[PDB]
Amino acid sequence: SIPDGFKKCKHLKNFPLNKQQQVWLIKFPSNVDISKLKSLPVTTMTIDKHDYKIMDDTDIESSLTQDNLSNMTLLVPSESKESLKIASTAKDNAPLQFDKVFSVSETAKIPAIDYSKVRVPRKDVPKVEGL
């Protein structure tokens, strides 16, 4: 029961699946043009001279110590490029689990607490002059 304004995604682009290869999920700020980047670390990174922080949020999307505890399931184009199948790799149809989940998010550098301006000696109660 298609809602107002949505059209079926007709021609789905290609997704080359398969020390072997890994599948990652990455969050970027919506305002970031992803189509023009180069680097990526394995801490901190800058994109378009503005600086961000990369966090390994894998233990939130899944378990590090135990298998099959993944929140997300990957859906890849099927043999028609007009629909999606659950992505698998196991030759068992066991759904693919993300190898890693990364969050590229905003950071705010913090400065020091100017103790010179702020930690000031006590002053005595002022003597009244000219008594």
Partner 1 sequence: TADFRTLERESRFINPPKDKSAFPLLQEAVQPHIGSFNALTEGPDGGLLNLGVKDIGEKVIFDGKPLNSGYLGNKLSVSVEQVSIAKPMSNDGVSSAVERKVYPSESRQRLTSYRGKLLLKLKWSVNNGEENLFEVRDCGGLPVMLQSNRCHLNKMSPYELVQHKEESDEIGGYFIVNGIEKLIRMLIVQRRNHPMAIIRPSFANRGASYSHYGIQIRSVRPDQTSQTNVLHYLNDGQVTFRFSWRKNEYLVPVVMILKALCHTSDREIFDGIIGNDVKDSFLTDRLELLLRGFKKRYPHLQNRTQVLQYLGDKFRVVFQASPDQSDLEVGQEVLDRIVLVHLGKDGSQDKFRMLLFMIRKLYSLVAGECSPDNPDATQHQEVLLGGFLYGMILKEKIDEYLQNIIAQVRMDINRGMAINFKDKRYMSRVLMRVNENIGSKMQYFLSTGNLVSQSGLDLQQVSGYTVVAEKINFYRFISHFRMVHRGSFFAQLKTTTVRKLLPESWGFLCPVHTPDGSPCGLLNHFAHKCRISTQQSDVSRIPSILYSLGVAPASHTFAAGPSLCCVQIDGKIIGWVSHEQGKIIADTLRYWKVEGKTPGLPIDLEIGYVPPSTRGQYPGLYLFGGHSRMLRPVRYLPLDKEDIVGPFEQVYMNIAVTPQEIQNNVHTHVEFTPTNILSILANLTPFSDFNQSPRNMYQCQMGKQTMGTPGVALCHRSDNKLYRLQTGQTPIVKANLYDDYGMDNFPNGFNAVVAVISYTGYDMDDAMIINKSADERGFGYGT
Partner 2 sequence: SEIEIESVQDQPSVAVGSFFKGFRAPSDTTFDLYKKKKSEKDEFVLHGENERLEYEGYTDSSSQASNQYVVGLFNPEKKSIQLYKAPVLVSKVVSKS
**Residue 45 binding result from partner 1, partner 2, none, given CB thresholds of 5 to 8 Å by partner type:** none
Q: Please state the length of the chain.
A: 131
Is 11 a binding residue for partner 1 by CB under 8 A? The answer is no
Is 55 a binding residue for partner 1 by CB under 8 A? The answer is yes
Residue with Cβ nearer partner 1 (55 or 87): 55
Is 131 a binding residue for partner 1 by CB under 8 A? The answer is no
What phi-psi label fits residue 92: left (phi over 0), alpha (psi between -120 and 50 degrees) or beta? alpha
The 10 Å Cβ neighbour count of residue 102 is 20
Q: Which two tokens stand for residue 64?
A: 């590090």
Give dist(CA 84, CA 82) in Å, integer: 7
The only residue of 63, 73, 78, 83 in contact with partner 1, by rule CB under 8 A: 63
**Segment contacting partner 1 (CB under 8 A): 2-10, 60-68, 74-82, 91-99?**
60-68
Is 42 a binding residue for partner 1 by CB under 8 A? The answer is no
Q: How far is the CB of 19 from partner 1 (least distance, A)?
A: 28
User: Cβ distance 106 to 29 under 8 Å?
Assistant: yes
Give dist(CA 88, CA 98) in Å, integer: 11
Strand partners, 57: none
Binding site for partner 1 (CB under 8 A): 29, 53, 55, 57, 60-61, 63, 66, 69, 71-72, 103, 105-106, 108, 110-111, 113-115, 117-122, 126, 128
